[PDB]
């Protein structure tokens, strides 16, 4: 009679919360999806071992189309777990899945886990200063999306920080690097000429959040555009005017150049 | 020989990540603070039991004024952990404590935990649509804080949602409720008369996120301002222009007025 939406966390199989692990262990069936995002620091096998249950993986179609035929039927007479990377209902559309559960007469509960939305606090950037978020998507064919450029403009205009999710082809396990995102943004700048993103723009890169050894770097596009930030996933941030405290953290912790203490404050 | 910033989670001792627990179990000394947020579903004892270590609780003054005198000295010869509610670097100034660690020659690591900042995803409001965040602070003496009113205005104009952290006076066991936040906002409205927060404003309340049965409610201020949302902690959200899919969830899951289903395009 119960369906548990359980967050897997940021990076590896230890990023799930104790609550989520123990509940997953007591469930009769455990499902998981890896199409909204991936757990770059672990594997299905490792996660299976930790939980001590076989995990049935579901595709985007299995969920978006046949969630009530695959998952809900079992949740009617058993305790079922549905695992997803990060924090459940975060940057996803699983929210409506709770409505599907309701109409099928199934109870559902959410077991939270860290999300990059909050994890980016490790960059030293104050959380309240973040504005609207966006995703940088790969252009393809005759399609060149640029709305993320406008989000940065509107945020920075109000002194707010912009969290930019980088394109990911989950099924193919292909990551867009921060380097690629920067190249894309410069190209967009060249087309819109808004003065939003240039070689002089200060950016922050967070790689492998959740890992004990994440890469946290800050500097101007001209110097970071070709830097190696390590293995994905990469997250790009375009800070607005930093607070003194923010800049100091970037310099002391993210190796930012002293120059930001006077140019970006 | 290192210092661990470990988040404890939203509600109870089990909201810590498995990563955080295993690491905390092997530390020589464990410190903590419980003034930045309220974990309404656990106690110091339970946390101590789970981690299997005695925990020395610090006050805001101990941290802000003497962190390098109390904690850092031990971290020079031992493995030390500093525990906090939710995520240690979200809506706190703890980030700066990493700079102090550096100067003391102490390497520090951060272990994330579920945060209210991402847990709001359970309201059904899309996380990317949130703008600048703010805190509703208790007025003290002749001093009546009001900036949070302008944050709402700026966000709403942009059709963005506004997350409002509520005040907390831990040493006095005072936890601002959504009801008090609302009362204060109506007062600010009467003064600034910007038409930002009135009896007809649609709001969302999330209480005790992290527990299995949090209170999730959406509705007009006139109807919710005197509603009982249960024990603290609470957060208040003033949504921007709602997406049809956000409205549906608010209605089906948060008991919102069915009329919000009719969005004015
Ligand atoms: N479990 C919870 N449920 C509802 N609100 C919460 C909450 N935990 C924190 N809050 C909100 O956040 C405020 C504290 S600010 C500190 C947040 C913490 N660092 C975190 O990452 O979660 C509380 O006063 C309340 O307004
Ligand atoms: Na945000």
Curated annotation (Swiss-Prot), chains A, B:
SUPFAM superfamilies given in the database record: Tetrapyrrole methylase
Gene3D superfamilies named in the record: Cobalt-precorrin-4 Transmethylase, Domain 1 (3.40.1010.10), Methyltransferase, Cobalt-precorrin-4 Transmethylase, Domain 2 (3.30.950.10)
Pathway assigned to this chain's UniProt record: Protein modification; peptidyl-diphthamide biosynthesis
Main enzyme class: transferase
Signal peptide positions (record): none
Keyword Isomerase: no
Annotated keywords: Methyltransferase, S-adenosyl-L-methionine, Transferase
CDD domains linked: DHP5_DphB (cd11647)
UniProt miscellaneous comment: The diphthine intermediate is not stable in vitro and readily eliminates the trimethylamino group. It is not known whether the elimination reaction also occurs physiologically.
Assembly notes: Homodimer.
Record protein name field: Diphthine synthase
Gene name, Swiss-Prot/TrEMBL: dphB
